[PDB]
Scaffold this active site. Structure first.
Site, PDB file in Angstrom:
ATOM      1  N   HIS A 118      15.934 -31.936 -23.853  1.00 25.68           N
ATOM      2  CA  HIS A 118      14.795 -32.811 -24.210  1.00 25.68           C
ATOM      3  C   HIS A 118      15.192 -34.204 -24.655  1.00 25.68           C
ATOM      4  CE1 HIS A 118      14.734 -31.702 -28.688  1.00 25.68           C
ATOM      5  NE2 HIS A 118      14.338 -32.982 -28.762  1.00 25.68           N
TER       6      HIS A 118
ATOM      7  N   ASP B 214      16.340 -25.434 -23.470  1.00 31.34           N
ATOM      8  CA  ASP B 214      16.604 -26.784 -24.017  1.00 31.34           C
ATOM      9  C   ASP B 214      18.114 -26.971 -24.250  1.00 31.34           C
ATOM     10  OD1 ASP B 214      16.151 -29.364 -24.949  1.00 31.34           O
ATOM     11  OD2 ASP B 214      15.286 -28.753 -26.863  1.00 31.34           O
TER      12      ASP B 214
ATOM     13  N   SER C 287      17.861 -33.632 -33.309  1.00 36.73           N
ATOM     14  CA  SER C 287      17.790 -32.895 -32.039  1.00 36.73           C
ATOM     15  C   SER C 287      19.066 -33.030 -31.197  1.00 36.73           C
ATOM     16  CB  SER C 287      16.598 -33.385 -31.199  1.00 36.73           C
ATOM     17  OG  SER C 287      15.354 -32.966 -31.759  1.00 36.73           O
ATOM     18  N   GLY C 288      19.499 -31.925 -30.582  1.00 33.63           N
ATOM     19  CA  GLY C 288      20.707 -31.906 -29.746  1.00 33.63           C
ATOM     20  C   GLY C 288      22.001 -31.710 -30.522  1.00 33.63           C
TER      21      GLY C 288
HETATM   22  C1  LIG Z   1       3.099 -31.422 -29.140  1.00 27.92           C
HETATM   23  N1  LIG Z   1       3.095 -30.074 -29.716  1.00 27.92           N
HETATM   24  C2  LIG Z   1       2.725 -29.080 -28.707  1.00 27.92           C
HETATM   25  C3  LIG Z   1       3.613 -27.850 -28.794  1.00 27.92           C
HETATM   26  N2  LIG Z   1       5.042 -28.123 -28.496  1.00 27.92           N
HETATM   27  C4  LIG Z   1       5.201 -28.706 -27.155  1.00 27.92           C
HETATM   28  C5  LIG Z   1       6.665 -29.001 -26.862  1.00 27.92           C
HETATM   29  C6  LIG Z   1       7.463 -27.706 -26.947  1.00 27.92           C
HETATM   30  C7  LIG Z   1       7.366 -27.198 -28.373  1.00 27.92           C
HETATM   31  C8  LIG Z   1       5.893 -26.932 -28.719  1.00 27.92           C
HETATM   32  C9  LIG Z   1       8.016 -28.215 -29.303  1.00 27.92           C
HETATM   33  N3  LIG Z   1       7.364 -29.522 -29.184  1.00 27.92           N
HETATM   34  C10 LIG Z   1       6.918 -30.196 -30.266  1.00 27.92           C
HETATM   35  O1  LIG Z   1       6.360 -31.277 -30.160  1.00 27.92           O
HETATM   36  C11 LIG Z   1       7.120 -29.596 -31.665  1.00 27.92           C
HETATM   37  C12 LIG Z   1       5.983 -28.651 -32.043  1.00 27.92           C
HETATM   38  N4  LIG Z   1       7.300 -30.679 -32.642  1.00 27.92           N
HETATM   39  C13 LIG Z   1       6.193 -31.281 -33.419  1.00 27.92           C
HETATM   40  C14 LIG Z   1       6.780 -32.601 -33.902  1.00 27.92           C
HETATM   41  C15 LIG Z   1       8.273 -32.266 -34.045  1.00 27.92           C
HETATM   42  N5  LIG Z   1       9.183 -33.416 -33.951  1.00 27.92           N
HETATM   43  S1  LIG Z   1      10.237 -33.793 -35.124  1.00 27.92           S
HETATM   44  O2  LIG Z   1      10.851 -35.019 -34.721  1.00 27.92           O
HETATM   45  O3  LIG Z   1       9.533 -33.730 -36.367  1.00 27.92           O
HETATM   46  C16 LIG Z   1      11.468 -32.526 -35.130  1.00 27.92           C
HETATM   47  C17 LIG Z   1      12.347 -32.430 -34.046  1.00 27.92           C
HETATM   48  C18 LIG Z   1      13.291 -31.441 -34.018  1.00 27.92           C
HETATM   49  C19 LIG Z   1      13.404 -30.502 -35.075  1.00 27.92           C
HETATM   50  C20 LIG Z   1      14.372 -29.457 -35.070  1.00 27.92           C
HETATM   51  C21 LIG Z   1      14.425 -28.588 -36.127  1.00 27.92           C
HETATM   52 CL1  LIG Z   1      15.617 -27.305 -36.112  1.00 27.92          CL
HETATM   53  C22 LIG Z   1      13.560 -28.684 -37.205  1.00 27.92           C
HETATM   54  C23 LIG Z   1      12.610 -29.662 -37.228  1.00 27.92           C
HETATM   55  C24 LIG Z   1      12.505 -30.602 -36.171  1.00 27.92           C
HETATM   56  C25 LIG Z   1      11.531 -31.637 -36.170  1.00 27.92           C
HETATM   57  C26 LIG Z   1       8.507 -31.216 -32.956  1.00 27.92           C
HETATM   58  O4  LIG Z   1       9.578 -30.892 -32.470  1.00 27.92           O
HETATM   59  C27 LIG Z   1       7.256 -30.042 -27.813  1.00 27.92           C
END
Ligand SMILES: CNCCN1C[C@H]2C[C@@H](C1)CN(C(=O)[C@H](C)N1CC[C@H](NS(=O)(=O)c3ccc4cc(Cl)ccc4c3)C1=O)C2
Ligand SMILES: [Ca+2]
Lengths: 53, 234
Positions: free
Chosen positions: B42, B88, B185-186
């Site tokens: 991603h 991913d 992430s990653g």
């Molecule tokens: C847009 N939400 C719809 C559901 N979602 C669609 C995609 C696949 C998954 C389910 C994960 N996705 C997300 O968007 C998830 C739910 N989210 C919400 C915001 C968040 N982003 S972040 O920058 O706060 C983030 C990124 C990575 C993380 C990793 C860990 Cl281990 C813990 C917290 C994190 C937060 C995110 O990823 C994309």
């Protein structure tokens, strides 16, 4: 708890069971010691070790 | 990383940072060998062109160990899907080899059966990165690390609004304010065993950061060991 379930079979790293006995092995860049249990790094900066110099 | 501690001298030598054209980090990675970096698929849609930086703990000062590497080949898993973040995972081959030194070394790849039976049954793993120090904050100028408990698979599925595939696992806390976050992430999820650190996961996604009743979701590296081995030969 027997063999690999009993304290990792005394292995430093990987443990597997073969015919009611423990077989130890190591990650790439390590060689198994003479005792067949410990793992010795082959060269400088082996994988998985925090650096001291 | 929300909560946790700074990575001290030599403590997180496998950390890599993906940097954009402005020299700003946008995702992490794990050093697997002199030529290969492990990251999240991603992350590959979050910058046009990027490079990889290693041996860095403070982005505001030159410490002496920093090295930037250009990317020769991007190897993204062909089954990755933006809809659910299933599969991913990606591997990067570098144009020039990484010269190991203080703060620059690879994490070990474990064997599948042993890692699932012995590493993933340990109390905790360790996550690291330059990401946000709280959900709505700015990115960290300091590399941080955090111990994260492994979470019961049924408990995680019950807590999640979105599907948890066979290629994912959960780690972190129910209510305690510690978790990975945006920009992490990653990056690496590693597990310590007799003072040797093995790669066990890739920072993937979460419903916000450190929210009550929610955990961090990681790519299950052990399901991809054969895939990683193949990608590292070509
Ligand atoms: C847009 N939400 C719809 C559901 N979602 C669609 C995609 C696949 C998954 C389910 C994960 N996705 C997300 O968007 C998830 C739910 N989210 C919400 C915001 C968040 N982003 S972040 O920058 O706060 C983030 C990124 C990575 C993380 C990793 C860990 Cl281990 C813990 C917290 C994190 C937060 C995110 O990823 C994309
Ligand atoms: Ca620096």
């Amino acid at each position: 708890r027997k063999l690999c379930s009993l304290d990792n079979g005394d292995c430093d790293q990987f443990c597997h069971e073969e015919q009611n006995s423990v077989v130890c092995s190591c990650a790439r860049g390590y060689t198994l010691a003479d005792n067949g249990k410990a793992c010795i790094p082959t060269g400088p900066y082996p994988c998985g070790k925090q650096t001291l110099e | 990383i929300v909560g946790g501690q700074e990575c001290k001298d030599g403590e997180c030598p496998w950390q890599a940072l993906l940097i954009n054209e402005e020299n700003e980090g946008f995702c992490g990675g794990t050093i697997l060998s002199e030529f290969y970096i492990l990251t999240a698929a991603h992350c590959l849609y979050q910058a046009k062109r990027f490079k990889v930086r290693v041996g860095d703990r403070n982005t505001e000062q030159e410490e002496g160990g920093e090295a930037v590497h250009e990317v020769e080949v991007v190897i993204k898993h062909n089954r990755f899907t933006k809809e659910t973040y299933d599969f991913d995972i990606a591997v990067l081959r570098l144009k020039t080899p990484i010269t190991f030194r203080m703060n620059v070394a690879p994490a070990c790849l474990p064997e599948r059966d042993w890692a699932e039976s012995t590493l993933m049954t340990q109390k905790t793993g360790i996550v690291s990165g330059f990401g946000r120090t709280h959900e709505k904050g700015r990115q960290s100028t300091r590399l941080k690390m955090l111990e994260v408990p492994y979470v019961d698979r049924n408990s995680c599925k019950l807590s999640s609004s979105f599907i948890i595939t066979q290629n994912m696992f959960c780690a972190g806390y129910d209510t305690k304010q510690e978790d990975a976050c945006q920009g992490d992430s990653g990056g690496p999820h590693v597990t310590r065993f007799k003072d040797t650190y093995f790669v066990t996961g890739i920072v993937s996604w979460g419903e916000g950061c450190a929210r009550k009743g929610k955990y961090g979701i990681y790519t299950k590296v052990t399901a991809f060991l054969k895939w990683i081995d193949r990608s590292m030969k070509t």
